[PDB]
């Protein structure tokens, strides 16, 4: 069972999220009170990476989903049989993988040989000129309600910073809810 | 014994029914308080499919009847001997038919022997918010050699083109001559 | 064409009554005899009393239906606005008028007029029977009533649907019924 | 692009009230009716009362936003100074000038098109017996902060909005944040 313990590590690795509000039309929104991201099926979910000092070149950024409830934590999070069916829009990603990265041609996907867990990794890139953080656009490819997939079970996304050799540099996590109206879901859950 | 657990699933699948009232002339009427449809032998029984987003083409909608009481739940629901003795498409033993759909498909489960009927899912028409399937029940709830006054539950399942279950809902049915009167009388309790 | 609004006391002497609630700031609903008009709040209890001179037979029913008062809008179906349509597990989301606290309530979408109504069994009483109506839209709801006055028509029907009596009253749904009634009665 | 500051009592008779705190030396906040101007200390409670003629619909929300008062600064976004905006933040974004204290349902917005900051809380009707609702605001920079407001006067705009975001009411007041509100109010009223 993968570790979810927060670790800023030596580079001061933290996650940030846009302050999007909860209007009805918002496509994603993060709740600080719940440390919970609310996003829509296969739509952009921006995650910011904040560091104290720049990690070495070749540093990588990995995302992995796990079930939040301890009696489900041993089950690998995957797409439901319905959505895992191949389509013409899978592109670079394995059809079973819940978490994709959008807009990064150097994305890499892993089925772990021993643990069978899915993850997606991209190169760490420093913020652009005039920016203080690096943003990754994740996509979640099932709904929280999917029968035969997550099946209403809550999940966490674990983001790890690792060096080119795979050693842990830092780790942080957040809960994710994938549904049609993130603004309403967040406003209702905070109530 | 097939599952009856309600799941809206990824597409927000739920059932809806016309608000038909209980006047004498009504040939079908649904009771929200009882989650129970009252309809007439071999007459139109419209069931609406409501979804929060559109399932892809190839999606299918299956209906199956089971007995509601656990004493009878392992017995296959079928027409009585009298009413078996068609439309050319439906097996004579099946209680539930779909009318007005040339793409209807009927299944005798090879292992459980249960009957079901399945049509392609079609999205709502222009201006409508739901898809309607016209079911026909081919036996009276009181048919001696069939249901014999035992209550039944109709299970509606949404499945994708590969057979994966997408969602499920159900309702009780009562088939008899005067649906309006039967719904009024049963709601007095 | 438009459903009849003409008063009819019928064989049972059917009339409506309303509480004499006054117009204090606290009142959640109040009826104006001078305007034959009920002032109530969104989704809150709006009590209507049924008065009869003799008891209707068992199986008698009581229907409520909203119609626009002005001749220019009389043929348009009164419905909830799109906002409020987006509850109780029994009422259709498009219906403006609900009945609260009656598990035997029945809702009708008329197959040919498309008009909405809500019906409950008539129960004998007290010296009157009370039905708690809820109005699920404001009178000013854009895309719904949109500041067009409505009437509620109350009909008494036998078990076979024959009319036994009919009465009506105007309805205004807004935030402060006491203030609204006092203001409208001033002018 | 500049938000409206036009006072709009709207259909519910929306008005702002303030405590009658006086100008003693030790007062931590004080409002000047003559100036329609609040004087408060950095990061200290600033009570603002909401008064309505009739109770707004369930799901109503109350938004606060700061803008510069002078015409030649009105297009600049009001934000915290670099010194103060360094990451006690709790639920609030570090760049936001205005926080709400003591409300776990608070929501912060970075407008995606205008880039302006605001903070929104649910409208709660007054408790049975009370005539008004109070929100506790905190201003997280001084008026004098170099790089931040940099001695420029600001207005706070309070908007009442329905659950869908439609304008129900608007009011505003000037704000001066400094160490001794009593002395600053008394002195500014001397002129
Ligand atoms: C953290 C970075 C920035 O500096 C701005 C706002 C959010 N990201 C991208 C642009
Ligand atoms: C659900 C749909 C609609 O939108 C109307 C009423 C019932 N069906 C067909 C037409
Ligand atoms: C319920 C059924 C019917 O449809 C008629 C009346 C009573 N039974 C037998 C015949
Ligand atoms: C008609 C009945 C009564 O007997 C009184 C007045 C109104 N309702 C309830 C109390
Ligand atoms: C009648 C209605 C209300 O409830 C408020 C005040 C006046 N109109 C519009 C909003
Ligand atoms: C005017 C209205 C009312 O009728 C009650 C008391 C004061 N406001 C809000 C609810
Ligand atoms: C659809 C299926 C294939 O045909 C290959 C590509 C994607 N998926 C696994 C192997
Ligand atoms: C509305 C305001 C008052 O009038 C006092 C009681 C409640 N609130 C604070 C002081
Ligand atoms: Zn899925
Ligand atoms: Zn039969
Ligand atoms: Zn409305
Ligand atoms: Zn500062």
Author numbering:
A (entry chain B): 97 to 287
B (entry chain A): 97 to 181, 185 to 288
C (entry chain D): 96 to 181, 185 to 223, 227 to 288
D (entry chain C): 96 to 182, 185 to 288
Paste lines from the article.
The human p53 tumor suppressor is a 393-residue protein that in response to cellular stress, acts as a transcription factor by binding as a tetramer to a wide range of DNA response elements, activating various events including DNA repair, cell-cycle arrest, senescence or apoptosis. Mutations in the p53 gene were observed in more than half of human cancers. To uncover the structural basis of rescuing p53 mutants by MQ we investigated by X-ray crystallography high-resolution structures of the core domains of mutant and wild-type p53 bound to MQ in the absence and/or the presence of their DNA response elements. These studies reveal diverse binding modes of MQ to specific cysteine residues that stabilize the proteins and their interaction with DNA.
The crystal structures of R273H and R273C incorporating covalently-bound MQ were determined at a resolution range of 1.71–2.05 Å from crystals with four independent p53DBD molecules. In the crystal structures obtained by the soaking procedure referred as R273H-MQ (I) and R273C-MQ (I), bound MQ has been identified at residues: C182, C229, C275 and C277 in both structures, as well as at C273 in R273C-MQ (I). MQ-C229 conjugates are observed solely in the crystal structures R273H-MQ (I) and R273C-MQ (I), obtained by the soaking procedure. Well-defined MQ-C275 conjugates are present in two p53 monomers of R273H-MQ (I) and one monomer of R273C-MQ (I). Bound MQs is observed in monomer A, and both enantiomers (with partial occupancy) in monomer D of R273H-MQ (I) (respectively). These conjugates form several stabilizing interactions, including hydrogen bonds made by the carbonyl oxygen and the tertiary amine of MQ with N239 and with S241 side chains, and with the backbone amide of A276. Additional MQ-mediated contacts include CH···O and VdW interactions with the side chains of Y107 and S106 from neighboring monomers, respectively. These interactions stabilize MQ-C275 conjugates in monomers A and D of R273H-MQ (I). Unlike the other MQ-modified Cys residues, the current MQ-C275 conjugates are not compatible with DNA binding because of their predicted close proximity to DNA. C277 is located at the protein-DNA interface and involved in base-specific interactions. MQ-C277 conjugates were identified in four monomers, one in each of the four crystal structures, shown in Fig. 4a–d.
